[PDB]
């Protein structure tokens, strides 16, 4: 079930979100 | 033909939970003896115990996944 050879979209979207959205929001912090 | 083989294979594969049970029994058992050494730091040792139990459960849980896979 988990192996249906349609793995392109998920990898692309995960790379986009992880390497753009979260780093940019987390950078605007103070300590 | 194949139903019996799949059922007996699933029944044989489901015996892999013994190791996890033994491991979790061992870890918690060590925790109580370690705590008795000094009542201080009980939260730290407790954190170590919880980490160990979770790790053992993760290492032993994926046995049943093969059984469910063979069943369906």
């Amino acid at each position: 079930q988990l192996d249906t050879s349609t793995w392109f979209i998920t990898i692309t979207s995960m790379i986009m979100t992880l390497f753009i959205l979260f780093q940019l929001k987390i950078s605007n912090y103070s300590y | 033909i194949d139903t019996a083989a799949k059922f007996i294979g699933a029944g044989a594969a489901t015996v892999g939970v013994a190791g996890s049970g033994a491991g979790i029994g061992t870890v918690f058992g060590s925790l109580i003896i370690g705590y008795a050494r000094n009542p201080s730091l009980k939260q730290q040792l407790f954190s170590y115990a919880i980490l160990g139990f979770a790790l053992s459960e993760a290492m032993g849980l994926f046995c049943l996944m093969v059984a469910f896979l063979i069943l369906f």
């Binding site: 079930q1 988990l2 995960m14 979100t17 992880l18 987390i26 | 979770a54 849980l61 994926f62």
Partner: protein
């Protein structure tokens, strides 16, 4: 039947896996003032508390990786907790993104180690000290041990969540069936008791996933 949620990449006329996976980011407002409301102060306090407990080992070069690790742990933790909702779809269930997460960082560490410390990075294969006269035997042990790290690191995450959801669904089906025949609230008691463990089992996985990578990076840094 049971394998319906897993094999369902957000069924729609147009796939919306991107929308599902990008949704969690709309829960972390960015600070914009010296003193802010309650909802973001807790977030920044938690981030500060977690940072000082993990990245306090590397000397200078590992301090650069701090932002990436915090982003990773927050992302995985947010993805896992949101999946406990009744009809959600956890992206971490799919093996594709787990395989697309482990390989890049592991490769980065392994060929970062060789670039700067080739002499010492080559020596770590042979265990330190004199291992009697069994050198060729263990040399082939640790090198094959090297390659198994990403595979296990992905497979355990891909397996445990599916196992938990299967257990929940089966116990729910069991407690539904026994309504017709006799009366037994022991099954719903089992469900409510197991839900605590399933709720607190995700964060431990996040912590282990991040910590193993921290240790691996520190070895070659």
């Amino acid at each position: 039947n049971l394998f319906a949620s897993f094999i369902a990449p957000t069924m729609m006329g147009l796939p919306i896996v991107t929308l599902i996976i990008m949704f969690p980011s709309l829960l972390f407002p960015t600070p914009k003032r010296l003193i802010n409301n309650r909802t973001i102060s807790i977030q920044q306090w938690l981030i500060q508390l977690t940072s000082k407990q993990m990245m306090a080992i590397h000397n200078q070069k590992g301090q650069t990786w701090s932002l990436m690790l915090m982003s990773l742990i927050m992302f995985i933790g947010s993805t896992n907790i949101l999946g406990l909702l009744p009809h959600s779809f956890t992206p971490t269930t799919q093996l594709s993104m787990n395989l697309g997460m482990a390989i890049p960082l592991w490769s980065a560490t392994v060929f970062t180690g060789f670039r700067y410390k080739t002499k010492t990075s080559l020596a770590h294969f042979l265990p330190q000290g004199t291992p009697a006269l069994l050198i060729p035997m263990l040399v082939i042990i640790e090198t094959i041990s090297l390659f198994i790290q990403p595979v296990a690191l992905a497979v355990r995450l891909t397996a445990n969540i599916t196992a938990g959801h299967l257990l929940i669904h089966l116990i729910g089906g069991a407690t539904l069936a026994l309504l017709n025949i006799n009366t037994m609230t022991a099954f719903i008691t089992f469900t409510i008791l197991i839900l605590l463990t399933i709720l607190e089992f995700a964060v431990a996985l996040i912590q282990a996933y991040v910590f193993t990578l921290l240790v691996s990076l520190y070895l070659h840094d």
